[PDB]
Design a protein around this ligand. Sequence first.
Ligand SMILES: CC1(C)S[C@@H]2[C@H](NC(=O)Cc3ccccc3)C(=O)N2[C@H]1C(=O)O
Ligand SMILES: CC1(C)S[C@@H]2[C@H](NC(=O)Cc3ccccc3)C(=O)N2[C@H]1C(=O)O
Ligand SMILES: CC1(C)S[C@@H]2[C@H](NC(=O)Cc3ccccc3)C(=O)N2[C@H]1C(=O)O
Ligand SMILES: [Fe+2]
Ligand SMILES: [Fe+2]
Ligand SMILES: [Fe+2]
Lengths: 267, 267, 267
Amino acid sequence: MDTTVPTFSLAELQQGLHQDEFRRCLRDKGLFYLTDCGLTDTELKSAKDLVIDFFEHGSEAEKRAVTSPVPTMRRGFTGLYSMCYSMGTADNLFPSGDFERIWTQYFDRQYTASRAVAREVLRATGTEPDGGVEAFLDCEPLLRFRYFRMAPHYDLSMVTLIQQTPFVSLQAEVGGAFTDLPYRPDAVLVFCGAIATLVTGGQVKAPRHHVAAPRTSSVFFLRPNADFTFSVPLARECGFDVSLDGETATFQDWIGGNYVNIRRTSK
Amino acid sequence: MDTTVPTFSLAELQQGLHQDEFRRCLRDKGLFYLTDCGLTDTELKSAKDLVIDFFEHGSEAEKRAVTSPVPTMRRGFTGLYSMCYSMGTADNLFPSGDFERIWTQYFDRQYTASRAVAREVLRATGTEPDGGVEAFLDCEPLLRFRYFRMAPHYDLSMVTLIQQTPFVSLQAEVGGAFTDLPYRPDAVLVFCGAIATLVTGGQVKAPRHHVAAPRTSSVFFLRPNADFTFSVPLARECGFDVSLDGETATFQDWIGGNYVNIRRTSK
Amino acid sequence: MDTTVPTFSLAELQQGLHQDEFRRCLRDKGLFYLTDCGLTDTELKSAKDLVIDFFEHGSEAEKRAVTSPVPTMRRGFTGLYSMCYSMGTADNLFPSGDFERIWTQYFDRQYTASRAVAREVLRATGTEPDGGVEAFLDCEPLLRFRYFRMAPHYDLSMVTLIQQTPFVSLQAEVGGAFTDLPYRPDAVLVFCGAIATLVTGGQVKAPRHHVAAPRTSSVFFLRPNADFTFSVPLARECGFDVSLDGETATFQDWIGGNYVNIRRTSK
Ligand SMILES: CC1(C)S[C@@H]2[C@H](NC(=O)Cc3ccccc3)C(=O)N2[C@H]1C(=O)O
Ligand SMILES: CC1(C)S[C@@H]2[C@H](NC(=O)Cc3ccccc3)C(=O)N2[C@H]1C(=O)O
Ligand SMILES: CC1(C)S[C@@H]2[C@H](NC(=O)Cc3ccccc3)C(=O)N2[C@H]1C(=O)O
Ligand SMILES: [Fe+2]
Ligand SMILES: [Fe+2]
Ligand SMILES: [Fe+2]
């Protein structure tokens, strides 16, 4: 195994190409850049531009009308010496007139790409989730766009898609050492998270990553439904320090009644 | 909307005065000073004085006899280069002879004021909790008195009452920026917490607050019972990033088996 | 009460000696060194030596083959500018050929000593766990060996056994102040954790401890099963700030679906 973060074309994967290379990437690294998945730089511009014009020029009242009453960063605007804009499949809060269109299309592209790669991850590992593949992937995504440092953690998602604007702050553990993860023109960076490890019975690594110290980021978490069900003994076999009585459990059983998106190894 | 933290008299509120002003305060700010609620400065003195005489002059054995065996800061004394004294409605640990009297009366005054303002918050928003108003308010309060810095968080209470001794360290987000919250002679500072937002279907803001860097504080958390029940879809509509299967849930379902009093927006 | 961290011989305890001294130690301090429990310095050498030879000379591929796909520090190797090696009663990941033998024997010695002292703690306090003593002690231990700072916390274990290599970084609160806890040639340091307090109805202190700033440590957590059941009102009486409806609950109910090993007093 070398220490190169690989790149895969989603379309080539969907055509059955690079099977061994993909499978070993998932087992040994758990991250990769993904091309050919409908996330062209053009589009990040349309979405980026109008959010960035809301962030700098939205009035305090305009911001307040798209702020939730609890500051959870789940939907709408959050002031944080940074600003965030969050979305999912429903219950969104949109500025204006043309923002909704642009951002619904952007979200859709990312949700589709995310489901698609996750579908390939399942296929590559021979995994049939309890309840089937499509009910598993029809889930609880969350998109956060941040505009202007992260201690090492791993994601609790199935997969996480990250688009950025281009010093390389983002690094990940590859082969036992942190490696730069720079902006890739027509690629998105995919991190496998803990739910990939869980659902596939340990066939996918969930790598640790952080942001080092010396701008904008789009992070799409593909998160399972509360009712995603898994084998308890199987979870223990792959490193999950579960406190679950009995033989099956749900995501809700494991993580509790509020989504938790990341975890540190520390305790 | 201006950036002034308002003041309301509880008695005027109870008489039906300032309805619009109160309702908009709750929706747009979620904090206010409260007068005319039975929390006169005199009384904080009686209680403050004798706890402060326990903190400086209680022996190590006297302190130990009012320390719980797990250092949870729920009841009795905690050494923390600060000291804390905690109370609720039962299972208390009291020094001496006259402390119990003074502190039971002080606690009662604060629990009554807390229930009263919460009653007004419910009324102002047209909210009938599942199970009714009075069973909701007959809850699980916790009073902590601290004697001698806080990163931004919001409270998970229904309301939080804060009395202090008088540089202004306490600040809260109002209108998108942090604002000083100084000692007010015959007033208590009320923060709405996340359970206010939850129970009222999003009609009350739970503002973020912190303690900035350059003394004593009394913080009364009005916390719901474990069995407080709410609509899951409704929770999602107001920003709660819940992982709850099905249509209703309890506080225990949401937060788990141990009270959590505060939360950071971060994850 | 003096501020000396006591030492007890397990064999003397098992013979009925030092009953008062032991019981008061548990109530007032909740920590002690333990001799005569089968944890001779020789043995820590055998185990220490071969893990330390894996840590410095195991290749990246050899390390990877004993690394779990989620970096939870539950089993096998973790890189962390430190390395960890973790074990329990099953699902272990072992280097080589002779490591498994050595480390299985080492783990067994520590699990036996841990159950033995816990048995004495129960006996000294007259405690019969729900379901009986031996089903309680046939539990979910976790051993972590760390090779090269800790903010104050208390353990959520029944007991924690700590062997170290010999400035004294480890300190604990005894009598209201932090006290050095140096390496003891043929002794192990025992901290009672919160489950000792819980199961005994408050008869055992769970002391706070930390690592101060100016090497290797072996920390064995004896952790209850998910189904360990306790009285809710009784828990509240001893300081546990539980949010549990009804009269009995399990460890899983209280802490959730993932083990949590430590807690800070802070919230
Ligand atoms: C958890 C994260 C949001 S942090 C990392 C990256 N974020 C940034 O690089 C922006 C940032 C700047 C300063 C501090 C934190 C994050 C980004 O996006 N990443 C997410 C992830 O790690 O899955
Ligand atoms: C969570 C808090 C206990 S912190 C804040 C204030 N506390 C203080 O101002 C005293 C303090 C000094 C230094 C560090 C933390 C708190 C106080 O009381 N506040 C509580 C709240 O925010 O609801
Ligand atoms: C939680 C701990 C793992 S930390 C403490 C001691 N660990 C060390 O002394 C090594 C260390 C060095 C630097 C930072 C943290 C821990 C050790 O072992 N202790 C454990 C405990 O406290 O029950
Ligand atoms: Fe992440
Ligand atoms: Fe607070
Ligand atoms: Fe510890």
